[PDB]
């Protein structure tokens, strides 16, 4: 394992099976009682073989448990089929986002399988992206229907769950959204000659007669919207939800569907099948949550990609969408492990994300004429324009909310999910081209008074910040942020940073009693009460 | 069209239908009476679309006719099916090596054609590579069975010839070798679950019951050798021939056969389907020309690729093979038109070719022990080793003949084809990494002095040198070289350079009365007597 640099983060992690108390410096509030589960990649080499993409590493989950003003750390691999098969074969066996599976001599274009492959859907279950709450439990997810319930206290892998038993989808996001009733929404792709994006809701099994309090059984299709090009449907990482609407971008990142359906024979990864179609406008697709009907407006924007939406809400007949905008994501080669090991991913200017707002008029007034900015009468919409076109469509321009590049956006879900709001917290892990020292950004959506927490040295890397509210608080930022601080150097111990969300001033940190924590993805904080 | 640079060479050429006398400076020998036909790419744009690879341009043939101490120039497109379809087009209609045609909406994996595609074979007849003599005529060839007879005087496209009507191959080289009897040898690939390399002879249609004196009908399989990996057979550009043997390299450039067979659905070019398998040794495959039996020796080398073999001959029970060795050819992306337009192709150090010799022992003595260099008692084999292996195989190492990078090798075919010899003439068109000005190289295979003719300015590009013998001569180099000098500048007229082969000193040049001649490939000189 290398002493310093990003290669250090790509050596295999080992289980930390027993929770270890972490060295605390500072103080935490009385309401910091709960458990944060973090998902991400942890196994990058198997024997002499190496995974290719950041998204590929086998899921290695961590538990950050807060109790009596202390923090306890543990970590374990997810016991997926992908993991078990690879550990038992000491070879890369299961396909992942960007690494080939072992070639099967019985699956060639000259074998009988070539006559059966359309009947088959190969299970991809490296659920290393995030955790999704369903009733009383958390499920580890990736961008497939194949999930695992995970024990909050022990990180034990419990039973598998197959989303596609309830709705016919081939892929789906690992970023399901949920509301105050605990109902869980997703969008998935059903591939075919008329590929469609399928919008789903899963009712909270606790609020209804169910087989158990963590069941997915109450899952149904809300509606669906066809891909513009059925053979090149958009890739999708996340989507947005307001009180009444679900919204997605038809991005320039497209899946080459015929190549993916044949990928076993042409020996292509899912990653190989992504293409950047810069010659096409982005479209906004909006579905009514109650009727399942698509909003009848054509909504076009200049090309861009977003991994993550922030919050989404309705105001004055408009749909407000915040998201982290990337000018040209390509096909995500920037996040190949070879390009991250050098650190050069951080300086790919066209790939860096910036928090961005777009404002969609949900109706066009009868007095409006082509060329009119339909937002001109919306005072709070300054910096966005949504211009009526000659053909009745609308062209939307965005406002960059913050000049500091940021991603992994989070907000005060308990108070203002699906409502007008002021703050987005994010991380600068993707990089920066202006030399800024920022690690965590608190972006101000109303007055532009942004706050930052700076990385203390070049070996610190900020993870996704999680907002935990003060139960006795009233303002949107009355709470703390939990921020995992990863380390790319043996000179820097990893730690969990606790910030006052109002000021981004540190109140405590907890040093991890291990040399490394993963260059990970998303985390979920479950309060004890 | 730009005033200067390689982009000049990638604008479409226009027909020059009538021979134009060229401005002569200097003097030529009395025996320079004959016709040189040159093949190469000339049409690179169709409407606003552009072909992608150097190998793609539709064939544009030139005639350089030497007579009465004069040279006459004319040029015309080859009237293939591809050309005929394309002039009547506005987008790329005929697919080539590295460019797709427009997609057929009825040929998706969801259509009935997906059940029929293995029965269908699309004709690729852009015969733009070289000319091959068969009886009394010349045939324009590419790396497919589809050829055209071409009139020596008018460049008129005559009748098509389909090699696959006489032997079952899917592809074959455009670098057929021939002997003093006018027999024509090739190697072609028959793809399938046990892909094989098929070795062929075409008996001179003269001296035999034939439909005419240029017929391919007397074509038979000499034998065949299976690919080591039937789904990854080697790409092949050329091969070698001695008095009694045919020899080919199983190179690291491999065809991804499954991807190629499915290329209509995954929208891949043949070029896209080439891959560099750097982790594999090169194998030498040798076939006896008379008996069709494969040499029962296993012969391995460190990876490399060669476009062009030079001469090949037997001596003292060994098989001597000369060829232009490239360390890492990748999948030929260096020769994409985008990378040639910038001139940067000339400085890809691992892609540059170097004339090279390897020496194959055709038997292993009973006294030989593993670890023995089987060439140790062969005095002239210095710098080469063929070391017997523990498993009975032979591992061969090569000798770099000349330190100046060179390709398009030619030799004094009339005197020493298939015999021991001294000289290879070549061009530096592929580039150089040391800034040298060399244009034409005369390499000495007997450890002698290599001679060079230097380009006069950076806008001169040397084509393939052809050796024309002095009939009164005795020495191997008693003759002249004909060298097309292409121009990348409106300040430089293209011309044909006539060099004394003994000294590589110019005796004459003929200025072409056109602004450009193509960045072309191979040429054939047919003497008038
Ligand atoms: Fe994500
Ligand atoms: Fe060639």
Author numbering:
A (entry chain A), B (entry chain B): 1 to 529
Recite the paper's sentences.
Purified BCMO-1 was crystallized and the diffraction data were collected to 1.8-Å resolution. The structure was determined by molecular replacement, and two BCMO-1 molecules (chains A and B) were found in an asymmetric unit. The two chains are highly similar with a root-mean-square deviation (RMSD) of 0.20 Å, with the large differences occurring in the helical dome and reflecting the relative flexibility of these regions. BCMO-1 has 39 β-stands, 5 α-helices and 11 310-helices as defined by the dictionary of secondary structure of proteins (DSSP) algorithm. The iron is coordinated by His175, His237, His308, and His522 from blades II, III, IV, and VII, respectively. The substrate tunnel is a bent cavity passing below the helical dome. A narrow neck unequally divides the tunnel into two parts. The main part of tunnel (also indicated by the orange dashed line in Figure 2) runs from the entrance located between helices η4 and η5 to the iron center; the minor part heads to the interface between helices η1 and α4, which is likely the exit passage of the product. Trp54 and Phe430 clamp the neck of the tunnel. The ligand observed in the active center of BCMO-1 was modeled as an oxalate. The dicarboxyl groups and imidazoles from His175, His237, His308, and His522 octahedrally coordinate the iron.
